[PDB]
Amino acid sequence: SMSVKKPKRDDSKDLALCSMILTEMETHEDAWPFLLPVNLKLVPGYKKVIKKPMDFSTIREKLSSGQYPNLETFALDVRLVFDNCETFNEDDSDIGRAGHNMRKYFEKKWTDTF
């Protein structure tokens, strides 16, 4: 509350650490379904069903232009990529499996870093 704060956490390295995690995400061999926005003109149903599309290149642009006020907002967009993937793809599919793998890969790097 007012004039009552927890000991101040060093958040000066968060931006660079999130960039590092995103670079690791972008270079994983199963990152290919998430590198660029899903093409809404070429994929029927996607624009209608997925209300908040998200991909690694949009995340990179947002991170690089100061559009993440904190750690949590970055993690929400990364998780949104995989929540969208689960909504539109069968678990038993290459993209469906790519999503589950990339999520597990992200969550470990996220716990280990922060």
Which listed range, 12-20, 26-34, 72-80, 106-114, lies at the site for ligand 2LX (CB under 6 A)? 26-34
Which listed range, 2-10, 12-20, 28-36, 70-78, lies at the site for ligand 2LX (CB under 6 A)? 28-36
* 33 contacts ligand 2LX (rule: CB under 6 A): yes
Among residues 18, 21, 38, 78, which is the contact residue for ligand 2LX, using CB under 6 A? 38
Which listed range, 7-15, 19-27, 32-40, 106-114, lies at the site for ligand 2LX (CB under 6 A)? 32-40
14-36: string of b/e by CB count within 10 Å (b at 16+)? beebbeebbeebeeeebbebbee
Nearest CA among 20, 11, 6 for reference residue 106: 20
* 101 contacts ligand 2LX (rule: CB under 6 A): no
Among residues 34, 56, 68, 74, which is the contact residue for ligand 2LX, using CB under 6 A? 34
Closest approach of ligand 2LX to the CB of residue 108, in Å: 21
Q: Which residue is nearest to ligand 2LX (CB)?
A: 33
Give the whole-angstrom CA distance, residue 24 versus residue 6.
Answer: 32
First to last CA, the chain: 24
Backbone angles phi, psi at 11, to 5 degrees: -110, 10
Identify the three-state secondary structure at position 21: helix
